[PDB]
Amino acid sequence: RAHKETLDKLTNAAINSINLLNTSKVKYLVSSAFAGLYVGIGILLIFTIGGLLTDAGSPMTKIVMGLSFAIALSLVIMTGTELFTGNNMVMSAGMLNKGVSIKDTSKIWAYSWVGNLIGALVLGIIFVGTGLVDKGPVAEFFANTAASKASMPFTALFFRGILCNILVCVSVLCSFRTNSDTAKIIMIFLCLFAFITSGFEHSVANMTIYSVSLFSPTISTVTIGGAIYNLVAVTLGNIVGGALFMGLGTYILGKEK
Amino acid sequence: RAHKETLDKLTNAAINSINLLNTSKVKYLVSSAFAGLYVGIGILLIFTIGGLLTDAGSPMTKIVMGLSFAIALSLVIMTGTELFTGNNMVMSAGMLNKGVSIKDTSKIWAYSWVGNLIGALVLGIIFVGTGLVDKGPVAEFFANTAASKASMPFTALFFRGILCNILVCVSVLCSFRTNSDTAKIIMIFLCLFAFITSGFEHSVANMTIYSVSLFSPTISTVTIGGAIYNLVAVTLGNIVGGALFMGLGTYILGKEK
Amino acid sequence: AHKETLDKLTNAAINSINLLNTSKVKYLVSSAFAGLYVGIGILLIFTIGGLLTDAGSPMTKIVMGLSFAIALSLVIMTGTELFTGNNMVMSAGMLNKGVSIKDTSKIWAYSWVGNLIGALVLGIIFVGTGLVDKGPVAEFFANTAASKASMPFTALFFRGILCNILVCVSVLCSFRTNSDTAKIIMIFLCLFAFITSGFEHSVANMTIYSVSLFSPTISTVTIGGAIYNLVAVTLGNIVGGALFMGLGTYILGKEK
Amino acid sequence: RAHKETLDKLTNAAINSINLLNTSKVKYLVSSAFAGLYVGIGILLIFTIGGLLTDAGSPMTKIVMGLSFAIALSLVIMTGTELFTGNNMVMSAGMLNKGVSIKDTSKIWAYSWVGNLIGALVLGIIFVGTGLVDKGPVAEFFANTAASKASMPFTALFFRGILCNILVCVSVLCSFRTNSDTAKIIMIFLCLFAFITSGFEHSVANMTIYSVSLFSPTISTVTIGGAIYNLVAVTLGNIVGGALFMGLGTYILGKEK
Amino acid sequence: RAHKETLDKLTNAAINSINLLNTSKVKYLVSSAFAGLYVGIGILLIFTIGGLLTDAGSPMTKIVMGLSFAIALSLVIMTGTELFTGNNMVMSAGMLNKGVSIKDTSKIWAYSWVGNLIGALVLGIIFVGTGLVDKGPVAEFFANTAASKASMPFTALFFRGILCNILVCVSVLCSFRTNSDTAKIIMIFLCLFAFITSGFEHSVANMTIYSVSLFSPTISTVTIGGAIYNLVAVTLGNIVGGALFMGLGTYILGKEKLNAAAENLY
Ligand SMILES: CCCCCCCCO[C@@H]1O[C@H](CO)[C@@H](O)[C@H](O)[C@H]1O
Ligand SMILES: CCCCCCCCO[C@@H]1O[C@H](CO)[C@@H](O)[C@H](O)[C@H]1O
Ligand SMILES: CCCCCCCCO[C@@H]1O[C@H](CO)[C@@H](O)[C@H](O)[C@H]1O
Ligand SMILES: CCCCCCCCO[C@@H]1O[C@H](CO)[C@@H](O)[C@H](O)[C@H]1O
Ligand SMILES: CCCCCCCCO[C@@H]1O[C@H](CO)[C@@H](O)[C@H](O)[C@H]1O
Ligand SMILES: CCCCCCCCO[C@@H]1O[C@H](CO)[C@@H](O)[C@H](O)[C@H]1O
Ligand SMILES: CCCCCCCCO[C@@H]1O[C@H](CO)[C@@H](O)[C@H](O)[C@H]1O
What we know:
- Chain A is globular and about 60 Å long.
- The first copy, chain A, is built from eleven helices and no strands.
- Chain A has helices spanning 3-23, 25-56, 61-67, 71-79, 84-96, 102-129, 137-151, 154-177, 181-198, 203-215, 223-254.
- Chain A has a single domain (1-257), classed as Glycerol uptake facilitator protein (Up-down Bundle).
- In chain A, helix 1 packs across helix 2, helix 2 crosses helix 7 (137-151) and helix 8 runs antiparallel to helix 9 (181-198).
- The longest helix of chain A is centred in the first third of the chain and has 32 residues, at 25-56.
- The structure holds octyl beta-D-glucopyranoside (BOG) (7 copies).
- One octyl beta-D-glucopyranoside binds next to helix 6 of chain D.
- Chains A, B, D: InterPro entries: Aquaporin-like (IPR023271), For/NO2_transpt (IPR000292), For/NO2_transpt_CS (IPR024002).
- Chains A, B, D: It is a multi-pass membrane protein.
- Chains A, B, D: The chain crosses the membrane at residues 28-51, 63-87, 108-132, 152-173, 185-207, 227-253.
């Protein structure tokens, strides 16, 4: 039971993050851009899988996709780059613990969110240039998924955003609670398996879904307005999951009061 | 063999548990709520898998479910949160070893059970909010499974509860006997694989099964009375498995006379 | 590091007899746990056997093998007393003069009986679940028990030999590594090999027969059949664990 | 984050590579040759798989290929041999951090490329000598893939080269950021799964694809020209991903300014 | 790097190996017998899989077989027993580094080879005793495979031996380069997956294939003549892959070329 020690670590991570931004916006945005790109790589992989298996009428499609998404957050954690969603639990916890302020928190959130988007846009442009979404089941999978994500009612997206960032943030929490990098990766694998296959919504992964779909000439299904709609609802849910549940929760567990 | 060392660890853990509760009810309940919700996350995943594969008439359904449940107790162990079924072995061993009283034991059992339920209820509510059990295979898998669990004879449920918590508690026992976080997860993975696929009954997991089934307007195959009937029977079996077998068993192995 | 490994087996054999001498209750409880833990693996893979056989899957025996790891993993990770592993440990320690032949047949008899008690307890409770009342799982239990009891002695014996080479070698590996993950992986590999290849394990068979005989579901087994298989497989296990692994590890580690 | 220490490790690794070359061309070229062959060994495996599953009409072909390619970079990393692609991030980061010169960088790039090719040629010759590509589904998978890679448009190969080496190099980046050899291998497995299954292009791996196809008398439709066309386009893409993204990126993250 | 330390370890191993053989021929042959039998255990498993999936017309057959062969070298490495094929790299490297002599080498190679063969025969004899190859797809898989290996052209068998032992030895090489036992097993799992599925030939493993078939009663369609053929070709291949490639390779990488006390790099 190292709840106190854990809260200390979260607090210290929150302090490191705002310090980094204060020290250098370039370093912070480059870090954020890597993470958004790393997450997008997971999307490129499982949407390829989605296309191959959906085309095949496989009933295992969504299961194989969940099993195969682990690389997204594994890369972020193993490279120590800045990810908006995890920042929800970290900043909220550290703020509550008086290590950082409400101002530092909204700042980290806004920069990391925008920086992650930069990575998704860059990934989308390059992926399109591969010609891999020119035509076929993979392009179709992007188009249909982007459309479904954009036409889904707000309430549903929001709540899917909550459960998603509970899983993402708890996998980040595990990485703070162990010294085994392998166990970190395993826990990340399990959590991303759970959230992808269950149907939960991640704001940063979705950036790449819309990035690819919008930059691609072969895909005329969704528009920027749709992307913004989905992203706003999912981002708000992510925040509630990561800050209101995980952040507030771990503070309460760890706060020597 | 380290049987004494293990008993000392169990005894320490029991003491630390009752101290947390005595120190702060809010912390204890928040911790319990977390565990309940983490276990529930496993149910959402494997029930999604259930619906998917059952609809397709796959023979692998229950095997894939068992293989995919690991996250449930993996999250509990890696976050160090209070789980009722695990507390059955810990408090019991510690009690026999005079580390904690009978009253402490009943108190810890009652609070964790309720806290676990709070987490299940919350998860259930939010999950229904996702729209993910609005219609289709997953909703039907929840409704049908909840029903078959609620109509099964008491004796059958009881004994399934015994075998389940032997497995859950032995997976917890293993984590007290290794310093390797990966080995803990692996053993947890194996144990949950065994108890899910074999057909054994877990009270805290069942909490989420019924919270979803009752909170969802598209699920009316069961009633509160049914959920209560199952929970009582299964809880009773869980307790026997955890305290009578694992608790007393580990006490006997490690008690220097 | 053969020498140090022999030392480890010798100390383990010494610890076993000392435990039995100090407390029969503790030794039999430990034994009962191991038998139950192994039985748990049988409950899992026979559930799988039922499900996949019913479906005419060619992968049935391959999935059973991959899924049996929990059986010896639980034993190893809980530090409980398993008969089959004891065949190598005691024989090695015996040849090394850490324990006597008398100690060895005493440990072998007590762990065997204690393993059985675990199997019986498990069978009874598992039948109580109603999980083998009817269906392909109950049928897989009945059919497997029946085929194992009717098989010729010589076949069971040699299948018992190869099974315990694999089981005891996985135990040997656990003495040669400080990594718990490595132990479990080798156990996984070895049980995969012995289940899927079709070798026979006495202790696991105990649960096969306690379940089949405790279940009112009609089979062609009988107690005479169970005892037959158990005797044939146990002797086989003993040769493979004692004559091969026990003797071999002693020869490798003995400074002579 | 340990960005400074990471950049420091990259720089020392770059310094060590040029040192080795300057000390002994034979040593460096033997190391390079090993890496090229180790990578080629991955190709023999997944192209055997590709053949078997292609001939079966399995929709899982590319998924199984991706999952089975881990050995390629795992061997390189575990043997500490010189691989051209990974050298793109390492020499560029080290060069930006003023540990090695631009000349050292293009020297290491030229020598490791040629060394890698020699391994691929040695492997290709020996493989053909086994008679495994005399005829059949594996021979045809080598023949057809070599052709489709040689006839693909430059821009598509280029961008696929970029994304491939971001994945290879980030997997190399991870090996620099953990002391766990198991975690190194898991991350390599993930990154190679992602790049293979997604369809990205790797220059060194293609060397073996073309050595096998060209050395094989089992008639096909490639030619040295087509091989040169593909290798040039993919190599340039690899360089951009490894140097311009990963090298520059990690340099900015860890630079003391 | 760290090739120099690795070369030291290979040299020390070759030394320990010849010391043991000189200390006790009984201890060395028992070790070699274990290793041969551990490898064969892998064959019994994956050949059972062969039969089961071949008879079902599965396309995943050779993939599942490759994935399932890891136990063979995993047991050898984890038990620290003497396996002929690994000895090709070890002895050759140590020899080049002047830790052991050409005579020392050929003696280890000869004794380990024979020791491994003993384990296979003993394993084959016991396996047939199970009746598991009395009749059916598994018995047939052994028969058919033993035939094809015995009736394959020499050059092909030779080159398949080379690539096999490159893969077997590089996995042994990885075990010298890591302190993580789990990573050792994983790398072994990968290399044996690759070598089995790709279709390369391992001499020691083939000792059990022919052992089972020549001790098996249900027909032959083979002949010891075939076994000797295969075993001879594959063995020379193994030695080349292990000694010429991996042995010489690691030496070159790790020999600090100050010394030079004899030869010059460039
Ligand atoms: C490529 C350039 C990216 C620029 C992103 C800047 C996002 C600014 O975001 C704003 O930052 C303020 C502090 O400056 C905070 O007070 C606000 O809460 C926040 O919205
Ligand atoms: C975070 C959401 C991703 C925003 C990426 C916007 C990139 C838009 O990209 C543009 O989209 C237009 C239509 O939408 C197309 O007509 C253009 O061809 C395309 O370049
Ligand atoms: C949401 C608030 C949850 C409070 C749960 C408290 C229920 C306590 O319940 C009782 O606790 C006693 C000790 O206090 C035990 O002795 C009794 O066995 C138990 O029934
Ligand atoms: C895909 C599942 C494979 C899991 C492989 C587990 C590899 C973990 O590796 C193990 O990690 C431990 C940390 O707990 C360390 O103590 C051990 O030294 C190390 O071998
Ligand atoms: C421990 C078992 C969980 C009990 C939670 C009961 C919450 C019930 O909740 C109610 O369920 C009714 C039907 O069941 C619905 O008609 C109502 O809309 C809903 O509010
Ligand atoms: C639940 C009761 C089970 C008790 C099992 C006791 C079996 C004793 O077994 C016997 O023990 C003797 C020494 O006591 C040895 O000399 C014999 O070799 C051994 O067969
Ligand atoms: C047998 C294989 C020998 C290969 C030696 C390659 C020598 C490469 O040499 C390098 O080439 C670079 C461009 O190619 C130049 O930029 C460098 O100045 C030059 O040193």
